[PDB]
Ligand binder design. Structure first.
Ligand SMILES: C#CCOP(=O)(O)OC[C@H]1O[C@@H](n2cnc3c(N)ncnc32)[C@H](O)[C@@H]1O
Ligand SMILES: C#CCOP(=O)(O)OC[C@H]1O[C@@H](n2cnc3c(N)ncnc32)[C@H](O)[C@@H]1O
Lengths: 665, 666, 665
């Protein structure tokens, strides 16, 4: 076979995992929405793509959302000019669909499980309380002169009121722009200026993992260079003394106490912008999502990819500064009317048992996190997870990067006790909602495979050299989409040329994701890393996931990243950055001996061309807060270009860049 | 042996029950009542409007009574505790469309407003067409000033018919009007203009009332020196006397409106978009906020049922639009129903005290609605001004704003109604939006001084004020509360929701607290006998202001009285009475010491030994607001020697009376 | 002995009636007319559109012809006396949705605009898709400037196809466009920009017309020195020649639109929201049209007066600065979903064959132009038209002034080859759409007669001295309308008093057009000139059209204008300005002899009272850019008031005023 699965210690013939009994409607669990096999998925999926799928999408849109005005046209526009339209004549409001309609049905149902940084401070927030708080904030924003179409910046940590802030903007038709709490003043400034908001919402301080985030201090530094911001609303999260500017800055509780606890919903066109979300090369990229298609995509993917039922308690452990928090903490779960988790802490605070204490306390029915969190808990030891119950879980999700089969198995074995479906969800900020993922009651999974495209997604593999679609199976190339889908990003804010050039020009007629992909002999899709991260060794194309998956098969390896660099003989050579577990004895095992064994492991599993030319042992890797490993930073450092690096002040650990610069020289 | 007594009356109780008269029975060609013919017909309909199955009735009434651009789905939600009351939330409508356009499309030449000018010879009818055209011109002017949906607009206008055009022009574009009584001082106007943060003010060059000039533009000029946000003033040329105009800021209404077309589209408003702010007559000005659909529905239904309004009716509410009574029962209620409404620019006694009745016979008014202060005023002026009029076009006479003493009630019944009209005593507040407790005139047999029974949608209880517990059964007295939200309840206090919750929702959690004392007699009739703050406690006996004042006016020659409490060592509190005799009363022939002695015995005979005033002060007038409320708080603080902590009293009806009362106490 | 005579013609009356030709009878492969085949078929349909039972017809047409977001309840209300005209008041719609989106959703690649560039080789077809995308980009740009619903936007654009996108971008967001003829002077532009109080102006670097450069940005910069409210100028790069650009205020159209997405939601407009202000050419008069009635009127008149069918290619050769361009280039044709021509050139550039080269190249099915253009081509000679095909044409239209029978016949003979119906369309900026015109499939035409009123128009003739309606036929007086019609102008911008005084006060209960009119014995209507231009000779009333029609019957006459002046004996005396063809030899032919024959011709055809007291031979006449002859200018010069003429800097050829002033003295 030309296309191989990601390296695993399990043989292939024992590596196919059918939907487990918890996903078969047994042991009292709800029956899956799609099942019980691959054919039930394909039969439904075929209704959602092609020239006869308008019927299905119109019905789903009218069944799933409450509309003030019906639409006439299902879809229009396209990639070439970036004029994508879905349900254009309809009107609706996102806050109405996420709060009001559920509040009118069951006001005391829990909307948010607020898991505070200190576990003892956690509590449930009802739909009634969340709707009231949202309306008070919306009334405060209107009193500042915020109109429909105005942008509002949000610099809030993971406290439950962050959802009220998002939905207050949606309620009045303002465009929220959320920035990770803890981003530097410089990074915050650039995003506040780019979206041209006149109002910013923040906290006095944030609390994450027992550490204080000095959010109001950062905000004051940033706003000295933000001439459009006239009002700042400050939530008193810690009560520690912070500066407040007379006139400009007001306390959230004091402002909201002035306002009634209901606010009318602005009637939004389907294509009115809902939010701007800046990704984390050059200027910040503000990805713009509209209202109806985005909301529909998040609601349908939540329902089908995680098999959400009305009583479920959905635990997405990500941050609302990330698209994962937008779609699968706030918009998806609340549109469906279920309970969603807002997790304020880290996976290891107070201890690495935190995730599993949370699951057993609240009886979470789904858990959703990133491979970086999974690898972190994998390296912390089985004592923190082995003696928990965790049987309320039916589905475990992974998002943000390829999941190494080694990490996949740890997730499957300890979090799921081999009784949960594992959904590896591939998508991007620009896709709005999950693009490729197994439907858990239908798809038999392979460790590290996203499996099959979601409803409305018609994806292909293109040879990057020819620009032509590769038909059949056992093919590898770059991932593209043939047709628009409801939740696709509509533009890059005030930079539509960047939007067309990045996604629509490389392969005209297609959407270009920017990731390498392979379709194996069974038709399963494998997303093996960024196209920019592919290493070309003597004409052999190497993906980062396969080498990193091979490296982590060696004992004591916690996390790795591989990058290419120009080589005189092979064009490019592989350089590995390897993080061993801190307990690994670097004196008993020689670094030169460990590097040799790692290279042989890569050679044994992939081939002679894949063996790293050099291996660097580092204590950690440069990562974004969402958990993405910044291989571009490592690649430029290896190239001796530690000067041409972009904005690195808001990465997870800025100091690790210094350690990497040292170890290379 | 009854714990609860009717307000003191010279008529014995056995002859003091007044069944709906023939004009309210569909006889003599009068329209058949909407509800009747008895108490049970009221309860039968009322029971559909409260309780857990009342959504059906309210949804049907909402869709039958108003024109909507978009239908609602949800009937009601929210509640008292957080102040998130919602009615018909997904619906959209426009108040101006419901008060003007839909009636104009059906009968453009029908009279919308009977404009009774200060001089009777200048009175005229204003058709729906003309009112709609003027409203649209003003709305276009406001839009040309940059007024947007949700912006507040202050209105400082006297009772000329264009005041209705100004209100409805704001409603038409979704602006929030804030009307201030014309004649309020520059200080009171300033405080309200600044609180609502408006950028536009609408006023007149001058007002005319009772042959006197109100220097409105002068007051406005003085106020705006401390109102830095107001950028545009639109000035109506009511008198044409020369007034200063500030270049740029001030423009003439007629010149601005001549530039604009006579139609303007209606802004499609959410049911819960704010319709207006109305500042009430203690501390900082309280801007009571009403939303759109529930408020409009409440005014339309109360006008229809409490006054038994029919399509050809000519409704004469004689109040001022600076008052909630003018908002609800001059402009929004009558015009929403598509009938004719009166805008009365004068006083009850100008040129003579026959003015009200000349008006009724001139225009054939079918209902008259006024305040007890006006009724007591006309009672004091003599029967020659009323006895020889016809007045037979009237079917219903209403009283609003304070308890009506049975003595005044009977005068109203006897001379205004010639014992052939139903008398509707309507209890409500600015915060309730529309009438809360009132007799339905074709159904309820009235008792002088009783509001009788709660209106549709109002589920009221009597609570022990200390324990918070409901007093079940009849013959109980305590404080009035409502159990559930109703469509027209005020939604907030502007930018001060904490004050709204603390005032109405926090004192008795789970209820709306009106602030008035109340009693339910053995027949179940409700008696609202005064504000809770005005109750006097003499030796453990709770005394209401209405009962003592009603006993005092039973004495011959008494025009009007007010009673307040003050600290007493032996009885806890003692009663002090301020008494206004008719000026024609001979105070030399009757000794003042004898008159006070006769008054005390009259009180003792009717109420009990404990109720006799410890001291009585004879005054030429009482401290009253413009709407006629007697300011007992002012009198109480003066008696307690707290004439330093009175507050803003510059815009009361007669500011000088405070000087006479302060002198007379010492 | 008829009191009312047809306009003077060289054809006897008995041979001057032209039934619909075979191309308008459904023969020779043409589509069957919407109304036909005779006068009774017109009356039968017309009678449904007027009177107290016509609501049914108008409600149905409104719902059949336009797409609505919200239905209306009331058909019509209001009236002339106070200027509160209302049509479909509760309805909501958007003009850009009706002219672009709904056609784009059906056939995106269909040509919306035939862009006939000033140079023929640069002409091209613009699809509905391309036009909608450019409209949406511009709308997004305007929104980014803070333009809100109800804001005025000035447009100073020449006849390039993006002018339609600029109009429709304003309509899309509910802004009120105010278009000013490109080439109007800085003073005339300044006055219109200041009157509408716009904060945004859209223009070009330069225009190109007849091979000449219009220095639009230079004119704009001079104007804006006296326009303190304008904050943003959007500049279309039409020529790329260097022009001044003011930092901050001025931005390039292509650079701004490249930042914006190619779709924009439609603002839901009430039927009576203003759609545009159009200043006519004392203080400038900004005529205001609302949305639904205006759009319905233009769509119905285009369909019925020009018998437009879905595949037709409609060629209106006027300028968008004129109401004719508003109604019959942009709004009418695009509302109907057909192809419309945007003609950037002049009728004689590069040569006088331009119109007919255009018709044969694009196979135009209808042609619409002004009598001044027809008279211009008539003077240029038959060689430029005689050898063209032109058989794709079915209907030829004339708009803007009376068409002399001599010019009518030239149009009929050479443009139409006696095989097209000629529609003489009478209307005004204030009427929105055609008022009186033959329906080409039903009405037999007379040269110079508008014939019969359009649907919804109930017109009468009033004796100006008595104010009374003249019943019956063979009557002459002033034209009035009895009832409002859907597309009537609703006000004069911020000058409603001028609106009432001009149109509604002279004859209370009627709309006063300002034109003299006669109804002949057959019931045909004749519009013979403005009331202000009527000449009173010894108590005999003379219209300009009849004398000007008689003068052009003389050989060598290209164009004439007749005006009155104070006379001691007759009250007023006739003065004629006559333009001979430039090839006419004024040395071989005595001017005194030519003047005598011209006077005798008038005496023979009209009578002794009409014979000009003086005749002036001029090389050209003072005309507006739309082609109206400025007889008010000529009258004041004859009266010796050549100083109090007012603003004449933006007329077609301002220098000709100097030549006329010389020749009179
Ligand atoms: C309505 C109105 C104007 O509203 P507002 O000015 O808010 O005054 C509200 C207060 O007026 C008093 N009041 C009003 N009507 C009555 C009545 N029929 N019987 C007894 N008291 C009455 C009470 O004290 C209310 O709380
Ligand atoms: C249309 C248009 C442009 O509108 P506008 O530029 O407002 O000019 C309006 C005036 O033009 C004259 N006019 C226009 N068309 C004709 C015609 N077919 N026959 C006779 N006269 C006509 C009249 O005098 C109108 O009142």
């Amino acid at each position: 076979h030309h296309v191989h699965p990601l390296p695993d210690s399990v043989p292939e013939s024992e590596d196919l995992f059918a939907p487990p009994p918890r996903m078969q409607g047994k042991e009292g669990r709800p029956k899956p929405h799609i099942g019980p096999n691959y054919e039930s998925y394909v039969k439904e999926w075929a209704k959602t793509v092609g020239p006869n799928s308008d019927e299905w999408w119109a019905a789903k849109a009218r069944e799933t959302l409450d509309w003030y005005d019906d639409f006439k046209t299902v879809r229009a526009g396209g990639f070439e000019h970036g004029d994508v339209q879905w349900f254009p004549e309809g009107t609706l409001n996102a806050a109405y669909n996420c709060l009001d309609r559920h509040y009118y049905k069951n006001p005391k149902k829990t909307a948010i499980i607020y898991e505070a940084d200190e576990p003892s401070e956690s509590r449930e927030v009802s739909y009634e309380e969340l709707m009231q708080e949202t309306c008070r904030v919306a009334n405060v924003l209107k009193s500042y002169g915020v109109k429909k179409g105005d942008a509002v910046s949000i610099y809030l940590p993971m406290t439950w009121q962050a959802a009220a802030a998002f939905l207050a903007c949606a309620r009045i038709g303002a465009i929220h722009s959320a920035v990770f709490a803890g981003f530097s003043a410089e990074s915050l400034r650039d995003r506040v200026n780019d979206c041209e908001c006149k109002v910013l919402i923040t906290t006095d301080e944030g609390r994450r993992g027992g550490k204080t985030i000095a959010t109001k201090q950062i905000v004051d530094a940033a706003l000295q260079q933000c001439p459009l911001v006239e009002n700042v609303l400050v939530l008193r999260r810690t009560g520690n003394k912070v500066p407040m500017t007379e006139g400009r800055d007001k306390w959230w509780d004091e402002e909201c106490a002035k306002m009634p606890a209901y606010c009318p919903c602005e009637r939004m066109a389907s294509e009115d912008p809902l939010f701007i979300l800046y990704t984390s090369t050059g200027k910040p990229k503000g990805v713009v999502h509209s209202t109806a298609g985005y909301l529909l995509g998040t609601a349908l993917t939540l329902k089908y990819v995680f098999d959400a039922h009305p009583d479920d308690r959905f635990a997405c452990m990500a941050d609302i500064g990330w698209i994962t928090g937008h779609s699968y903490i706030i918009y998806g779960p609340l549109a469906n009317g279920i309970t969603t988790a807002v997790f304020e802490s880290t996976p290891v605070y107070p201890t690495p048992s935190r995730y599993w204490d949370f699951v057993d306390k609240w009886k979470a029915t789904q858990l959703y996190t990133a491979p970086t969190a999974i690898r972190l808990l994998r390296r912390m030891g089985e004592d923190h997870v082995k003696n928990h119950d965790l049987s309320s879980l039916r589905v475990l999700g992974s998002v943000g990067e390829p999941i190494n089969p080694e990490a996949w198995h740890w997730y499957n074995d300890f979090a799921g006790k081999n009784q949960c479906a594992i959904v590896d969800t591939y998508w991007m900020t620009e896709t709005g909602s999950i693009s490729i993922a197994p439907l858990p009651g239908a798809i038999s999974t392979k460790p590290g495979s996203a499996t099959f495209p979601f409803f409305g997604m018609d994806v292909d593999i293109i040879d990057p050299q020819t620009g032509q679609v590769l038909e059949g199976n056992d093919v590898e190339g770059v991932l593209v989409a043939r047709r628009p889908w409801p939740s696709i990003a509509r533009t890059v804010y005030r930079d539509h040329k960047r939007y067309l050039e990045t996604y629509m020009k490389p392969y005209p007629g297609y959407f270009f994701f920017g990731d390498g992909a392979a379709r194996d002999y069974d038709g399963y899709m494998w997303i093996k890393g960024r196209v920019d991260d592919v290493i070309n060794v003597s004409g052999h194309r190497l993906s980062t996931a396969e080498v990193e998956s091979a490296l982590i098969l060696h004992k004591g390896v916690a996390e790795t990243a591989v990058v290419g660099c120009a080589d005189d003989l092979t064009g490019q050579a592989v350089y590995a950055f390897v993080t061993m577990k801190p307990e690994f004895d670097l004196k008993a095992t020689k670094e030169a001996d460990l590097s040799k064994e790692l290279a042989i492991q890569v050679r044994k599993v992939i081939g002679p061309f894949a063996a790293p030319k050099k291996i660097y042992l580092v204590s950690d890797l440069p990562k974004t807060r969402s958990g993405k490993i910044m291989r571009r930073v490592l690649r430029k450092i290896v190239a001796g270009e530690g000067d041409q690096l972009g904005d690195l002040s808001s990465i997870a650990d800025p100091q690790i860049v210094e350690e990497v610069k040292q170890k290379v020289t």
